[PDB]
Amino acid sequence: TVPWFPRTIQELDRFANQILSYGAELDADHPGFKDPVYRARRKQFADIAYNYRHGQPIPRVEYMEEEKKTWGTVFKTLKSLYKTHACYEYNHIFPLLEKYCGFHEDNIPQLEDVSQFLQTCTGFRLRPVAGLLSSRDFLGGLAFRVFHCTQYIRHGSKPMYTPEPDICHELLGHVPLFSDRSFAQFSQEIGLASLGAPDEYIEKLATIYWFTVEFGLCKQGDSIKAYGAGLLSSFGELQYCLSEKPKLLPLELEKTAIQNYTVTEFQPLYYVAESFNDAKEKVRNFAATIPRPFSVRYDPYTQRIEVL
Ligand SMILES: CNC[C@@H](O)c1ccc(O)c(O)c1
Numbered sequence: 272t273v274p275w276f277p278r279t280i281q282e283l284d285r286f287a288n289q290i291l292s293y294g295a296e297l298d299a300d301h302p303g304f305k306d307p308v309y310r311a312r313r314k315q316f317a318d319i320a321y322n323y324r325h326g327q328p329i330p331r332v333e334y335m336e337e338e339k340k341t342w343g344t345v346f347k348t349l350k351s352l353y354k355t356h357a358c359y360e361y362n363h364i365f366p367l368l369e370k371y372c373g374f375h376e377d378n379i380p381q382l383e384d385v386s387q388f389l390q391t392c393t394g395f396r397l398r399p400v401a402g403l404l405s406s407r408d409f410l411g412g413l414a415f416r417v418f419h420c421t422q423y424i425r426h427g428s429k430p431m432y433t434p435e436p437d438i439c440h441e442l443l444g445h446v447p448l449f450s451d452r453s454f455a456q457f458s459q460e461i462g463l464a465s466l467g468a469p470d471e472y473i474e475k476l477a478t479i480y481w482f483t484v485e486f487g488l489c490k491q492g493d494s495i496k497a498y499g500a501g502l503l504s505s506f507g508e509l510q511y512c513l514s515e516k517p518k519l520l521p522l523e524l525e526k527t528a529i530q531n532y533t534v535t536e537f538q539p540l541y542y543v544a545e546s547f548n549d550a551k552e553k554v555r556n557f558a559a560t561i562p563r564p565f566s567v568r569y570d571p572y573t574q575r576i577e578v579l
Pocket residue numbers: 403404405406409436485500
């Protein structure tokens with residue numbers, strides 16, 4: 272029968288008891304696997320996320336010198352590429368994040384301050400996430416303009432590498448785009464399309480998310496730039512995605528939804544969005560093809576989903 276989905280923003284609290292309990296930091300393959308301090312530190316952030324409840328301010332954390340150093344390295348190395356490789360919406364908001372959110376090499380921004388900033392721009396808010404959420408729950412949060420965000424940082428031994436999202440990827444990759452109104456509406460449409468959708472369609476929406484929010488390219492006049500969070504947080508792939516090597520195709524959802532992708536090497540192909548308004552329209556039409564015995568609408572005045 273129709274899978275359960277949250278109907279009010281507070282119901283997202285139900286997700287904490289539905290994450291993958293054995294995280295990536297437990298794999299012998301993880302850069303911090305042999306480091307017990309790192310291990311304990313990850314558990315500390317997981318407990319903060321576990322006890323968090325909608326409406327509370329997100330707990331502030333004092334990062335260690337070693338963690339600030341890793342942030343600094345990532346920030347400084349990536350920043351040199353944005354003016355030439357990132358889509359206009361990213362560069363338009365970055366200076367404001369540097370001024371009101373403390374995006375600077377010597378300081379890791381606190382999620383509460385960043386969340387307040389997003390609320391003022393587009394009403395998006397962040398909530399700390401323990402471990403891995405199912406695609407269903409992750410996408411469902413977007414329907415409420417809620418982005419589940421990691422608060423921990425990657426292990427210091429390999430600053431330019433992370434096998435999972437971490438705070439550098441969330442803040443330098445995702446946050447700037449969520450401050451844009453059209454991108455915010457586009458992300459929310461993916462979320463609304465996921466509510467109560469059958470498992471096989473959630474996987475199609477997760478793939479569309481991968482080829483837009485995480486690895487999307489924008490058409491900007493006669494040029495092509497990156498807006499994908501996975502590209503904006505990867506020094507190597509951000510330079511590669513705008514070279515002659517990858518194959519670029521126009522975003523066509525019937526096609527993007529079933530395309531296979533690798534999570535371990537640079538993407539061999541990327542989809543180019545005409546604009547976020549256009550991508551939003553395409554998702555809305557795609558959503559109409561999803562078999563759901565009902566229709567949904569979000570009411571921002573009450574923060575509830577209306578089931579039609
Ligand atoms: C929890 N869903 C899949 C996960 O690998 C995932 C999802 C969304 C992201 O933005 C991301 O960087 C990683």
